[PDB]
Point group: C3
Chain length 455, copies 3
């Protein structure tokens, strides 16, 4: 067989697993070992987006699950524990395992129980692992996937940084960014119509202050998984190129590409060399996923500009939208204040401030000034002040035709933004009303609900 390096030698190794986006250190070993892997399934509520909760099912408390790193030819003793708070039984199928179900039948584990099985890691490569319990798609859709790396015997080449990024598609009963605890939606899942498509389990998991980091001149290796359950990722780095892309344990290595297709259940190792400073965006280039469903992550590169290579400015909210900022924590706070019944005007203002970026500022500008004759001002806008309800209708339903704002005629078109949720429109408009010498007051989500029900 392949990976024929003999029986385990040395002492048993207890594998140290890491949480995304980090990776365990290189195994740095020239002999096969017995490696004991202990992974615990935990079901728990986490934020899939700001103010939006979801009951995740996780390997090790995170989505994706703990990263496992071993060497080709190791004997792996795999222990799966199912936390007693779990409602469902769980198990594991590891790609790269030689044997039926990738471990599935022997790792079946009821809540409060533990299972174990052993396998030899014959196949070098990066591999998805995932739950394999009926109904399988639900378990995977709830977050039960991660990566296992089986290193070549000599190790991978040294790089400056290694990161762990995994795409998944998620199916909520509610629409994108609709607040509250969102149940899983089987109808959307069967139809392959996800409400969110995400890197590492949440909107903004890898953006803003949670971005990945490197410096100019450094090499970055990223272990990229696609947990699915359903989507194939047109995986792409904005403004950069991959030096190498290698799928699973494949002999083929592609070089110098920017866009690469990762199958559902697939994994790849990609290598990047940072050449100029700024934010490089990892996306699924099925564009509505990246820009309307959350499928964007950032590798932020620090260092000296090189104007001979690129003269332009850093990425901003025109492209990245409301994820250009460090975080959108004001939205979480406003949502929690609504639930508690303590929503203040300032809670709404700060939430709207976060949501205004990109969404409105692309045309109206970050300072509300617009562009005279082309985009009308929201700053000190007589048209806004004159009719707040008309403003709600404008956001939801658009506006066109000749209007007069602060003494100037506009004759253009603002598209409808009907996908904004009632709280989002309310908070945005409350921000605008309380900025730029506008009259203050507030708009409530209930106000917006009524305007949505009858244009």
């Amino acid at each position: 067989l392949p990976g024929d390096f003999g029986p385990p030698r040395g002492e048993p190794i207890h594998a140290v697993l890491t949480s995304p986006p980090l990776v365990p250190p290189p195994v740095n070993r020239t002999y096969p070992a017995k490696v004991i892997v202990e992974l615990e399934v935990v079901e728990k509520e986490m934020q899939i987006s700001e103010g939006v909760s979801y009951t995740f099912w996780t390997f090790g408390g995170t989505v994706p699950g703990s990263f496992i790193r071993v060497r080709q030819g190791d004997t792996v003793e795999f222990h799966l524990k199912n936390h007693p708070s779990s409602k469902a039984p769980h198990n594991i199928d590891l790609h790269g395992v030689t044997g039926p179900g990738g471990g599935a039948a022997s790792s079946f584990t009821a809540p409060g129980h533990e299972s174990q099985f052993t396998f030899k890691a014959l196949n070098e490569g990066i591999y998805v692992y995932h739950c394999a319990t009926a109904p399988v798609g639900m378990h995977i859709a709830n977050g039960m996937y991660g990566l296992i790396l089986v290193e070549p015997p000599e190790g991978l080449p040294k790089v400056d940084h290694e990161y762990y990024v995994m795409q998944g598609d998620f199916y909520t009963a509610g629409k994108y960014r609709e607040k509250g605890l969102q149940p899983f939606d089987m109808e959307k899942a069967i139809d392959e119509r996800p409400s969110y498509v995400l890197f590492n389990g949440a909107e903004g998991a890898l953006t803003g202050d949670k971005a990945l980091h490197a410096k100019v001149g450094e090499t970055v290796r990223i272990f990229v998984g696609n947990g699915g359950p359903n989507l194939v990722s047109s995986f792409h780095v904005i403004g950069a190129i991959f030096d190498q892309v290698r799928y699973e344990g494949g002999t083929n290595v592609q070089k110098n590409v920017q866009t690469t297709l990762i199958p559902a259940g697939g994994a790849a190792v990609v290598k990047f060399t940072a050449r100029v400073p700024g934010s490089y965006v990892l996306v699924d280039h099925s564009i509505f996923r990246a820009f309307n469903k959350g499928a964007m992550a950032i590798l932020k590169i620090d260092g000296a500009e090189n104007k001979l290579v690129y003269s332009g400015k850093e990425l901003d909210s025109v492209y990245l939208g409301d994820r250009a900022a460090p975080n959108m924590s004001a939205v979480t706070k406003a949502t929690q204040a609504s639930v508690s019944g303590t929503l203040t005007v300032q809670d709404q203002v700060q939430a709207g401030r976060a949501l205004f970026a990109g969404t409105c500022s692309v045309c109206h500008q970050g300072n509300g000034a617009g562009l005279p004759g082309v985009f009308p001002p929201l700053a000190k806008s007589d048209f806004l002040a004159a009719d707040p309800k008309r403003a709600m209708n404008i956001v939801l339903h658009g506006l066109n035709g000749k209007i007069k704002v602060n003494g100037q005629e506009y004759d253009s078109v603002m598209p409808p933004m009907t996908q904004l949720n009632d709280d989002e429109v309310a908070n945005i408009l409350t921000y605008v009303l309380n900025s730029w010498d506008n009259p203050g007051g507030r708009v409530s989500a209930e106000d917006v609900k009524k305007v949505r029900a009858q244009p």
Copy 2:
């Protein structure tokens, strides 16, 4: 040109075609020949799933159609007959043919007619063929696709087994597993929302007693097609790796991968070496296809276990669900008994028995015992017996909160299983009621229809 080996020599060969999942023998020939291929289109009703009929349109009576095997440089005289019972005209486009439409204009054949055309097989490779008659998508969706292999002049390397597997997506008016003769649904097809995604034309075509077979140490070559019409397959083998994957006649060969993307209309040759015994599952790893729409096939490997490579057990119904068993023939029989108006309790029981596997047994166990305090028993369940209608509501709509069953408190969550059809819920519950010292009686599909209409 390529395949420039001269005019046909020897005698004309009448091609012997094979039905899936078998393949004709290697051509074992060192000279170009004239090869006469005769293929007949037949439209006919077959079972797409147990108790579910569909009007297939087929090349040679099967889906996929008869496998055609020739040598690069052969001159192929292709005869297409359209059976007189056909309602539609038909034709053929063979990928790998050099010429407009891949044969489409010259192979147009009305019902009861025959056509013929000739082409030189210049391009070595594995290729999809399919109908090319307006409306093309309908013809393909109804099953009109297969594979043609054009061998390299020296032949392919010898292997122990060769098999023929083709994915297709199907569009029925009714939902998945809704019984009866199901018409084609154009609205679902245009939207690329299939009701079934299948290997070789039917649910379970390649599972259970219809599994593919090999022995430990043997090599298996599988000719894999994706007839579409629409889907791209994240093609994957559970618990194994492909030694090689080669697309069509491509010069590139990938090695040591487990997951590979096959385009709509694409074909690949994959090679597997059996290392340990058990069931290896071929899936489309867009998981809801494999586990909710039928996209799973089995290669069952016989031989001695190797505990140093894999210590675990064979695949079971936890992962494979109700396809772990040899067949689900009881469902076909119960469905036919309903149509005839002769449905007995025992017909329902045996049908429910088949459907209970995986679907319910993952939590409640194959013996109905559950797990005390975690999953409540269905065996001798006082809670079940106390209210049969409540049991129908539980399957359809779920259950949560504190309950008492056989003197023990449970405080967990059973998800809804709303996608089960009325007959499936009726048969499952009838099985349960007539097992494990439960009180007997029956539930009817009409009972379930009423509970579905008002929770």
Copy 3:
């Protein structure tokens, strides 16, 4: 860095850009230059299909946008102008650019404004460029994408012809071929449910009299892009093979394949050698895209037939449907006559004539004769003449069972053709009624609207 060929030398070059499907000449240069690229965004209404208008947003007045061709190591000074008639601001992200956003932040351009930025072309390859303005998906869905080629320093190998083809998916409020100015539909876009999937911006952009051309024995290179926004293309040439397929600037080159997956936002260079005459169809082999949504383009090859390679006939309306003809201009004219209120019978007849090809002629024949006993005649049909309204119901809702037509019994099935729009059914039936000694008269779209509302 890569592309380290020194500072620009010689004189500044003003790039000459080309409109699809043409490509600028090879740069034919052995030194790095400064290349000044000037591109103007124009928003405008164009025909997405005959009688169907759409407001496209374009780079340079076309979809896809102007082709840009430079050499690896060039310094590119990129000027983006936004025409003053524009309603939206725009910018550009060029794949292959080294730097954040691929130019996005520095190329933000309000209506009536100009922006510029500079970059060094370090990466050789074919690359998509596209708008990068919030909401990004809308901008791209409206047509804002094209290709930039960065040649290797020695140039690409000489070929006889070079062409430029780009797929995109489009989202209209109305259904496929529903006439009028069609707004963009955000709901369909987010769900990845396009109404049209097109090469180069329109149905028939590259079919009939707008086909690409070459001669037997010549080599054709095609720069193929997938602008998306959302779909992955199972890109395929009917009846031919690609000698080479190279993605972006990748080191891997695949050879001798017919079907290849192009990611959303991906681009490839493919090479074809014409071997026999006829029409070769480029499609997205997700078949319902190619045959029901418009994703088909033609490379028409002139030259001597070779019966030893292919004995069959040229592609016709059986496969290609109504795109077999030179154009469908009669449909545009009938649609415009309806809007103006001047629709004549002959306008309808000529429009129906175009629409009858494939759609009806596959069974009923181009001369309406049918096939006695199998497909009934529309020529001098007593059954048609006897009840025009029944004919509308037949097209919309199908027909089966025993009928008598011109003294002969038929007992077959004509499927419903419910996806035909009211004007299409009206025009088809008006064509039939005014042909083949049928009684004349006309059917109106309003007639058909009433039959659709109640079968």
